[PDB]
Amino acid sequence: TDRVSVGNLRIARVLYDFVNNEALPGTDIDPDSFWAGVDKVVADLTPQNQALLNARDELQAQIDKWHRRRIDMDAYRQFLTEIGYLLPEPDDFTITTSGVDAEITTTAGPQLVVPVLNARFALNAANARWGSLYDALYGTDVIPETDGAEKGPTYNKVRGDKVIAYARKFLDDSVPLSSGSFGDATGFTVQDGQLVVALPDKSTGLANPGQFAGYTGAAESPTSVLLINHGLHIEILIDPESQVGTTDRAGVKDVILESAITTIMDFEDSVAAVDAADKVLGYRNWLGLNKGDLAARVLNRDRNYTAPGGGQFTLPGRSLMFVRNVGHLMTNDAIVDTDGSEVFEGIMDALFTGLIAIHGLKALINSRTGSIYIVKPKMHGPAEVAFTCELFSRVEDVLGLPQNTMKIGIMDEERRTTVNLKACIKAAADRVVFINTGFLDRTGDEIHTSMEAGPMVRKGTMKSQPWILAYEDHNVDAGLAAGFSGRAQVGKGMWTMTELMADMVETKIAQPRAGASTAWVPSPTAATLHALHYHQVDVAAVQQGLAGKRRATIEQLLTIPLAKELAWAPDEIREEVDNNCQSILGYVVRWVDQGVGASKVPDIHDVALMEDRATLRISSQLLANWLRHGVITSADVRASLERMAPLVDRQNAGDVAYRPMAPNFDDSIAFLAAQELILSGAQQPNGYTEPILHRRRREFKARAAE
Numbered sequence: 001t002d003r004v005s006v007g008n009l010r011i012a013r014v015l016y017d018f019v020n021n022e023a024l025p026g027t028d029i030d031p032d033s034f035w036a037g038v039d040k041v042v043a044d045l046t047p048q049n050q051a052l053l054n055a056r057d058e059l060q061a062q063i064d065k066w067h068r069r070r071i072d073m074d075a076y077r078q079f080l081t082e083i084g085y086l087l088p089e090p091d092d093f094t095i096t097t098s099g100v101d102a103e104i105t106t107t108a109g110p111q112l113v114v115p116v117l118n119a120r121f122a123l124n125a126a127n128a129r130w131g132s133l134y135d136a137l138y139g140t141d142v143i144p145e146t147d148g149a150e151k152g153p154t155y156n157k158v159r160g161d162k163v164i165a166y167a168r169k170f171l172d173d174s175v176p177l178s179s180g181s182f183g184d185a186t187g188f189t190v191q192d193g194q195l196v197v198a199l200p201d202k203s204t205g206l207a208n209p210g211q212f213a214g215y216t217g218a219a220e221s222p223t224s225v226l227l228i229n230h231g232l233h234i235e236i237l238i239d240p241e242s243q244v245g246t247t248d249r250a251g252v253k254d255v256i257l258e259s260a261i262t263t264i265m266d267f268e269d270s271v272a273a274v275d276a277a278d279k280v281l282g283y284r285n286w287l288g289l290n291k292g293d294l295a296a297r298v299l300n301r302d303r304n305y306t307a308p309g310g311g312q313f314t315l316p317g318r319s320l321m322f323v324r325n326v327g328h329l330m331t332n333d334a335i336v337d338t339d340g341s342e343v344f345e346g347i348m349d350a351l352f353t354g355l356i357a358i359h360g361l362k363a364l365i366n367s368r369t370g371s372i373y374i375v376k377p378k379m380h381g382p383a384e385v386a387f388t389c390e391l392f393s394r395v396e397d398v399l400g401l402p403q404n405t406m407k408i409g410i411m412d413e414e415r416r417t418t419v420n421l422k423a424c425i426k427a428a429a430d431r432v433v434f435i436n437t438g439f440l441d442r443t444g445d446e447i448h449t450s451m452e453a454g455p456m457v458r459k460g461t462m463k464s465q466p467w468i469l470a471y472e473d474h475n476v477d478a479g480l481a482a483g484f485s486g487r488a489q490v491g492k493g494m495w496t497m498t499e500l501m502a503d504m505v506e507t508k509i510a511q512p513r514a515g516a517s518t519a520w521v522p523s524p525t526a527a528t529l530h531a532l533h534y535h536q537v538d539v540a541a542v543q544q545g546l547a548g549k550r551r552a553t554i555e556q557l558l559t560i561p562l563a564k565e566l567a568w569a570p571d572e573i574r575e576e577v578d579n580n581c582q583s584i585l586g587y588v589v590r591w592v593d594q595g596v597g598a599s600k601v602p603d604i605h606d607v608a609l610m611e612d613r614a615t616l617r618i619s620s621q622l623l624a625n626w627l628r629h630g631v632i633t634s635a636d637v638r639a640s641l642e643r644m645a646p647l648v649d650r651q652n653a654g655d656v657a658y659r660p661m662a663p664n665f666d667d668s669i670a671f672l673a674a675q676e677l678i679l680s681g682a683q684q685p686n687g688y689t690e691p692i693l694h695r696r697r698r699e700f701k702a703r704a705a706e
């Protein structure tokens, strides 16, 4: 119709044009040979993809019956073994992934995640490798507004001084002088290769002069001083003529931190992309980032420095990029077969994002070691991991890339991956560069998998349940036992409260203390603040100290988060229903009506949260669970949705083109989607929301196409 026929494939025209005209040129790959490659890879791997998806349904159906036909933990576990859910743990091994960049193998630090469909955000992200500590401290609630230090339309000097002080204190804790404090420093010099600091009554150096990494300008009167601690860089910009530098005892203008060492450009949960036009926009942005010519305002270039002993060197000025493809579930009409059946989206993302990423290896650049970094979400168990690897192998042939060029980041966010984590890693032993954990998806799967067992604890309660604490520790243990320390990242989840930076600075330190190589932040600002934690915590030492430990048993992992009988008062029930209905509606309306997958969404208490699509999975699965066991009724669910809808409406009053859901609820496609997600929730595969979401978004767009 409006498609290009290649073999058994009917490629959407926008897609076909985009690959040939934009993606392919530069890659030395023959267009027709590429498309034929696509035709064959799709046909060859599609049935295998389907077999894995069906296998999920079989397991879940068996688990459903088992619960209904009853809690004997020993029998439950033996059952999961019998049905091939819980597979035998392989002997110890060590990953062999080679050609990995240092930012992944060695450097511990923040990792940004940004919706690929947003060129400006994506630009900021790639440039967030370096960010200003002053701007971050002054701009957020880390420095309390309190007494005369409040922000205004004018720069407030009382506040800047607190910022300066905080930064001086940080320098004391990070790169300690052999004597005295940074707060008293009056100047900085470089005599005989060693950084000398000017104190009022004397002069000292770094207690460990190894932390001196270089400088700019002349050794006598430098324009900046480069420091290193825990593999992370710290830059003191010295400029006595600047506004802040003028009033500073040492002429200091700013302190710059190496912040977002890596960034994940996201095709999955932070992006709304339900057809061929959407995917191209995303692919196009991914192309521009990889050719290094995206702009709206360009991509930063490397940074120049002078070695402590005179010579010249350089550091990368951009955030090393991953891409997150979609998982194994969804199809997309960007390609169909002759029968009209949509082609598997994950298979498409491997080919296209992989094709595109070729530009990142030639000059502008990304991986200096020659690798492409794909993060794969929502896999269920080790066979699904081996499938992803086999897919990568094939795509590499179509692209003419050396084998194992396309590295994998295994996200641990499904229960069948959690309890088989060592086997999952081993299936990717020569490609794996990353594992991580998070709250939303994983708890959604937790609730779905045990849907029939009984009513679950409230969402808040989940964060402190035995299963999830065991899962957090188990993740770290498995990676370290597999040799990740020095070879691959071990990550932990997102800080979602974008305006609550004091809290983040206070609490998020627990992640590197738990041995996390990296963890997720929602903004460049956040990345800068979070970098503090890796200065205070020596993650390599922590990881070294954790080795050999088994801090989580299979029994703990399998402890279902069931509510003890009569746990809640009727007002607690309503509070939770309301809370969850608000979460659905707040995220759904922006998603369906505007194709926005990630934004600052006020929760029921007007706190700004930055969650991806998975917030929909947990909240819908919880209410569906509570529906299934009669904690609440259908009258309850609808009443709550009707109450929260105008509240969401009001929270979007500051939106130039928002559309009310109230009072005409059934004419709101957004409202109907929220309602469907909940009432149809128990029947969704593993509780996945995309089937309902994609359809409703496509419906809204067709309604709007008039």
Ligand SMILES: O=C(O)c1cc2ccsc2[nH]1
Binding pocket: 113, 114, 115, 266, 269, 270, 438, 440, 493, 494, 496, 522, 598, 610, 611, 612
């Ligand atoms: O895990 C989360 O909550 C999360 C992921 C992403 C990606 C962009 S915003 C965001 N929140």
Ligand SMILES: [Mg+2]
Binding pocket: 269, 377, 413, 438, 440, 441, 614
């Ligand atoms: Mg997820």
Ligand SMILES: [Mg+2]
Binding pocket: 538
């Ligand atoms: Mg140390």
